[PDB]
């Protein structure tokens, strides 16, 4: 709904597929994924379970000098009704970084290690519990400025805010 979006900062499953389609369209660096067949969510299209972008450079640490690359996915958290960002860091010679080293690319200005809902292994992840409130603030701010954003743009807003959490990871988003 459009009222649920403005007042709660939330996102329905269909609206998630909608916004995700729009992210892929504008920023083709992002792709849809199916993931593990056994980890499929029946409330989401089988070919559209989560969104991912690979080989994303991170040339310096968040504390503001050696180059690391990231794979970062966006899943849909059915409980919070918000997207969730999951990141996988890599060595200067493209070897898997240990999840706790990613905290160095998180801004020290809450992130936690957990299992991915669609993939194997442990991923660092920004917890979504506060995303609703965050999105409500950003909606409020834009509304009075005259900009009335619709739900098909959630992810573009979502990712601009996420840039303050991971400033040095250079993924794509337009405005």
């Amino acid at each position: 709904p459009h009222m649920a979006f403005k007042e709660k900062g939330v996102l329905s499953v269909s609206e998630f597929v909608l916004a995700g389609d729009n992210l892929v369209s504008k920023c083709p660096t992002w792709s849809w994924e199916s993931g593990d067949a056994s980890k499929r969510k029946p409330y989401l299209p089988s070919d559209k379970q989560f969104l991912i972008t690979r080989n994303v450079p991170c040339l310096r640490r968040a504390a503001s000098l050696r180059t690391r690359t990231y794979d970062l996915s966006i899943t849909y958290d059915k409980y919070y009704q918000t997207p969730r960002v999951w990141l996988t860091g890599y060595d200067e010679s493209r070897m898997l970084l240990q999840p706790e080293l990613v905290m160095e690319d998180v801004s020290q200005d809450t992130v936690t290690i957990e299992d991915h809902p669609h993939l194997p292994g442990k991923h660092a992840s920004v917890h979504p519990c506060r995303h609703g409130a965050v999105m409500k603030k950003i909606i409020d701010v834009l509304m009075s400025r005259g900009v009335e954003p619709e739900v098909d743009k959630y992810l573009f807003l979502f990712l601009k805010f996420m840039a303050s959490v991971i400033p040095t990871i250079e993924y794509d988003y337009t405005m």
Partner: protein, 305 residues
């Protein structure tokens, strides 16, 4: 001055899920077999000015008992041993020439013309330690050494070489190619630009179609490399096909790279190379190098499991 052309090495990227996917294959189905398995590798153009793309093994890589914009399918083979000692006793040169020979056959049969995605054919030799849950592997990207090495005449940023109109028209064509599901993962193509400065992208087989006007023709390819002074590894076998089919002395090539998900011509490069002219399979090179040296790679996933 006409210098010797140097190709930037292709680097690999094995996603975690590939091993997990294989550890299941080995334990539930294969058993002791060390027999080779055919796999699918994925790559794409350069996506950022600072960082170049890779050949990526995912869990989709293993047989389904595929290929979008960001995943161009490339055929490969996996040799996984049961012990450390049998891994070390692998005949690298006979296995490299075995795979390089498969490429050359496709170049000769007109297969590479129909399907040029066969050119970046690759080899992986590995050792999966299912006890400790650590993995030892080595990637190989076979590329032929041309008897007299290809000579570079010039290499300009694509936006320099092209005008403004040409630039617009090329990237408009390039993005169209990337935008339609049938051509997105076809990583080798021709770029022709009419004297009117209108650009169109055609398949390799349509080369003969492409001779018509006072029109430039460029042998384009998805360039995984980001470096502004060297073309990527896939140019090697690509130039091999060009010589083997049409025996061109002078070849204009288009290093196709992108940024923000669309064609980027300041990043992309136009170059012209020079080749001299019964013959058999040349020499092959290219075992990927670790932090600098002829050494295999190892990853321990005991903590993920």
């Amino acid at each position: 001055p006409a210098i010797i052309l140097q190709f930037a090495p292709l680097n690999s990227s094995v996603d975690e899920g590939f091993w997990h996917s294989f550890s299941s294959l080995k334990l539930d189905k294969l058993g002791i077999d060390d027999s080779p398995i055919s796999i699918t590798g994925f790559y794409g153009p350069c996506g950022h000015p600072q960082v170049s793309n890779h050949l990526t093994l995912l869990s989709e890589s293993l047989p389904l008992d595929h290929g979008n914009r960001n995943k161009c399918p490339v055929p490969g083979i996996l040799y996984n041993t049961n012990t450390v000692e049998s891994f070390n006793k692998l005949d690298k040169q006979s296995l490299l020439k075995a795979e390089a020979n498969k490429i050359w056959e496709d170049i000769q049969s007109g297969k590479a013309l129909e399907d040029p995605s066969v050119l970046p054919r690759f080899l992986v030799i590995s050792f999966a330690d299912l006890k400790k849950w650590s993995f030892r592997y080595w990637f190989a990207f076979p590329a032929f050494v041309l008897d007299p090495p290809v000579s570079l005449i010039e290499l300009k940023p694509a936006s320099e070489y092209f005008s403004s109109e040409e630039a617009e028209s090329v990237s408009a064509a390039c993005n169209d190619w990337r935008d339609s599901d049938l051509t997105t993962d076809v990583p080798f193509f021709l770029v022709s630009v009419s004297s009117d400065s209108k650009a169109s992208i055609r398949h390799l087989k349509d080369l003969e179609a492409c001779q018509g006007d006072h029109q430039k023709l460029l042998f384009g390819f998805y360039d995984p490399c980001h470096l502004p002074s060297n073309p990527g590894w896939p140019l090697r076998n690509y130039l091999a096909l060009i010589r083997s089919r049409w025996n061109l002395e002078t070849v204009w090539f288009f290093c196709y790279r992108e940024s923000r998900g669309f064609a980027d011509l300041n990043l992309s490069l136009v170059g012209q190379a020079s080749i001299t002219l019964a013959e058999t399979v040349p020499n092959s090179v290219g075992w990927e190098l670790n932090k600098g040296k002829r050494v295999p790679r190892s990853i321990s996933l005991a903590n993920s499991m």
